[PDB]
Amino acid sequence: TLTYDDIVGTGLANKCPTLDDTARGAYPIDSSQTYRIARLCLQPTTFLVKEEPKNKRQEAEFVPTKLVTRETTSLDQIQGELKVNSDGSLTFVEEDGIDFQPVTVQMAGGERIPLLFTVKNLVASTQPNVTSITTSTDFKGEFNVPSYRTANFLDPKGRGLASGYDSAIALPQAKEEELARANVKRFSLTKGQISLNVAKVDGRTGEIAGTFESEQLSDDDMGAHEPHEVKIQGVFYASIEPA
Amino acid sequence: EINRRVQASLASGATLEEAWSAIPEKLAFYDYIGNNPAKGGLFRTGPMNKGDGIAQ
Amino acid sequence: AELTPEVLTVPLNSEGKTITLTEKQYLEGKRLFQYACASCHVGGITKTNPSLDLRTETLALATPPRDNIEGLVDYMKNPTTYDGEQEIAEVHPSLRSADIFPKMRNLTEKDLVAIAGHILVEPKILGDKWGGGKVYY
Amino acid sequence: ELVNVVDEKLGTAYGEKIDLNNTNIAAFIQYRGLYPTLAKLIVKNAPYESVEDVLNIPGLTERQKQILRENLEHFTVTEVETALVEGGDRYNNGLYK
Ligand code: CLA
Ligand code: HEC
Ligand SMILES: CCCCCCCS[C@@H]1O[C@H](CO)[C@@H](O)[C@H](O)[C@H]1O
Ligand SMILES: [Ca+2]
Numbered sequence: 006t007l008t009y010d011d012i013v014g015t016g017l018a019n020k021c022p023t024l025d026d027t028a029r030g031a032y033p034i035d036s037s038q039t040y041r042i043a044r045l046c047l048q049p050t051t052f053l054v055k056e057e058p059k060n061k062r063q064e065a066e067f068v069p070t071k072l073v074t075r076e077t078t079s080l081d082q083i084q085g086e087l088k089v090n091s092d093g094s095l096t097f098v099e100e101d102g103i104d105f106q107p108v109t110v111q112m113a114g115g116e117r118i119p120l121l122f123t124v125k126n127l128v129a130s131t132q133p134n135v136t137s138i139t140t141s142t143d144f145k146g147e148f149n150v151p152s153y154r155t156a157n158f159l160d161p162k163g164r165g166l167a168s169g170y171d172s173a174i175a176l177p178q179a180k181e182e183e184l185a186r187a188n189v190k191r192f193s194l195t196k197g198q199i200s201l202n203v204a205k206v207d208g209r210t211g212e213i214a215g216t217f218e219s220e221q222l223s224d225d226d227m228g229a230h231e232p233h234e235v236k237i238q239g240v241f242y243a244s245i246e247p248a
Numbered sequence: 249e250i251n252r253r254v255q256a257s258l259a260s261g262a263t264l265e266e267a268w269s270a271i272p273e274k275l276a277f278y279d280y281i282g283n284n285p286a287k288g289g290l291f292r293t294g295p296m297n298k299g300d301g302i303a304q
Numbered sequence: 305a306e307l308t309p310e311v312l313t314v315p316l317n318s319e320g321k322t323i324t325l326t327e328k329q330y331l332e333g334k335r336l337f338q339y340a341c342a343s344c345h346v347g348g349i350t351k352t353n354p355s356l357d358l359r360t361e362t363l364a365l366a367t368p369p370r371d372n373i374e375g376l377v378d379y380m381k382n383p384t385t386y387d388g389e390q391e392i393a394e395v396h397p398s399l400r401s402a403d404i405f406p407k408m409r410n411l412t413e414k415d416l417v418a419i420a421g422h423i424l425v426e427p428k429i430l431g432d433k434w435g436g437g438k439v440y441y
Numbered sequence: 442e443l444v445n446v447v448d449e450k451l452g453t454a455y456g457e458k459i460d461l462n463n464t465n466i467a468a469f470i471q472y473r474g475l476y477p478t479l480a481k482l483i484v485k486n487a488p489y490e491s492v493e494d495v496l497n498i499p500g501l502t503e504r505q506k507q508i509l510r511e512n513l514e515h516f517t518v519t520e521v522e523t524a525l526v527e528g529g530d531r532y533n534n535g536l537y538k
């Protein structure tokens with residue numbers, strides 16, 4: 006098969022595995038066995054940002070953006086328990102993995118939108134009575150979105166939350182209040198929402214693949230400005246295992 | 249000098265509020281680095297009031 | 305100031321016994337510490353794990369206590385984590401893993417005592433600078 | 442009004458004692474017997490409703506429990522502060538020497 010030296014520099018390392026067109030099977034679930042997802046992979050194909058209109062009577066649309074951070078976007082090696090619930094629904098509870106990527110996209114006109122693309126602490130569920138995972142199975146869930154920068158991050162004048170100056174030291178006698186938003190760093194933690202639509206299943210292997218769409222807030226630069234709403238779409242792949 | 253006057257005031261009975269209330273504003277104002285002439289810049293133009301402000 | 309007999313007098317064991325080192329042992333200790341240890345512990349710090357330093361107070365709170373000759377000699381034979389729970393000979397040089405840490409192969413018992421002696425004497429000279437890292441350069 | 446949550450935390454018991462819910466793991470080196478084995482376990486099994494709850498960590502040897510007991514006067518608990526616990530910062534908070 007393909008080794009690192011086959012793949013290095015091709016772009017494939019950012020691509021989730023695909024399933025053949027024959028993968029249309031059913032993966033049976035025994036409510037007596039415990040399972041895990043041994044590998045969840047999410048490859049974004051589109052980032053959309055919701056425009057923010059001047060009057061809030063206009064309907065705000067999600068608009069296309071251009072990716073400027075290259076092929077560094079995919080979430081992978083995610084794993085966690087796949088619980089079988091009382092009512093036969095399945096629940097994925099993320100425990101670990103490469104489960105975030107900082108991403109920057111650009112609006113028409115050049116506005117750059119950094120976001121922490123993520124499914125940290127994902128708890129996603131199916132509809133009830135899932136005796137088998139099929140191309141009709143879906144997962145819907147919620148996850149956490151912590152600040153895009155972590156607490157040590159210092160702005161360009163040295164100011165920070167867990168480190169840094171607490172004032173604008175270049176303006177030794179300016180008034181503080183107008184600068185409070187810039188000087189007092191804050192750490193956001195918000196919720197995002199995701200849906201995974203299975204489209205392929207290899208029952209013989211436990212592998213599934215399909216499409217996903219999530220929604221989360223973008224970088225608020227440690228409280229300095231209002232984040233935007235992002236909509237991420239792409240393909241996914243998962244390997245389920247008895248465990 | 250401000251410390252001397254405050255110590256004298258006190259030595260002679262004053263409360264701490266009185267002793268400090270006795271210090272002329274003009275003397276206090278000299279004891280402020282915004283008036284030190286070695287605190288400027290070559291391209292920082294105009295009156296001192298244009299930096300820290302007009303003292304009230 | 306001088307490197308005197310008082311400066312060179314250090315705890316031998318956990319029970320309060322001291323030992324006075326000769327100036328020659330001190331120098332030996334400094335030399336052998338450079339030869340075998342300073343690549344990671346230059347200045348009393350630890351390059352590959354900065355949480356742990358060679359300060360006397362730190363050594364005293366290790367398990368077993370390492371703030372004395374005997375403790376240090378034993379460390380150099382059979383190093384443990386700081387809580388004494390684990391034997392780390394496989395990734396920390398010692399007489400026990402002289403096969404994989406070849407500079408350990410010709411260290412004699414007397415050499416180990418000299419190094420222990422260096423580690424206990426330096427902070428008596430350098431104070432907080434020992435184990436202080438760059439703040440104190 | 443906007444507040445720096447870390448500075449605020451320095452006003453609570455987090456500023457006085459090792460906080461089992463927030464404090465970076467290297468702080469456990471300050472007492473005999475805690476680091477690395479108990480420190481790893483304390484951080485992995487956080488948060489705790491009270492200091493005593495640290496004794497209920499599954500799998501502890503008897504001397505482990507005894508070391509915990511001897512060090513409870515040095516511990517505290519406050520609410521998980523997101524800014525202290527995100528980014529694996531309990532494991533490596535970007536401070537070395
Ligand atoms: C000894 C001369 C002197 C001094 C010490 C002052 C001092 C002062 N003036 Mg007066 N002034 C002067 C002459 C002077 N002035 C003259 C000749 C005029 C008529 C132009 C004025 C008109 C004037 C006005 C209208 C005002 C002042 C004000 C002030 C105050 C602020 C100064 C400032 O911001 O400078 C800043 C100075 C600089 C930024 C220049 C620095 C040096 C330059 C860069 C040299 C250029 C180098 C050159 C390119 C080299 C090339 C050679 C080649 C071969 C390489 C201060 C008390 C201000 C105020 O507060 O008044 C109440 C104000 O409004 N001044
Ligand atoms: C890097 C490759 C090292 C060399 C060379 C030496 N030591 Fe070391 N030391 C190293 C690490 C990563 C650690 C921490 C290990 C752990 O997981 O706990 C240490 C620790 C020590 C200690 C314990 C410190 C304490 O405060 O209790 C001592 C006493 C010590 N090291 C001494 C020592 C001596 C004498 C060496 C020369 C023969 C030596 N070290 C080499 C990394 C490295
Ligand atoms: C509670 C977590 C804090 C960890 C312990 C503080 C280490 S900070 C400590 O400050 C001292 C200054 O005199 C020095 O002795 C030392 O070199 C320095 O690192
Ligand atoms: Ca489907």
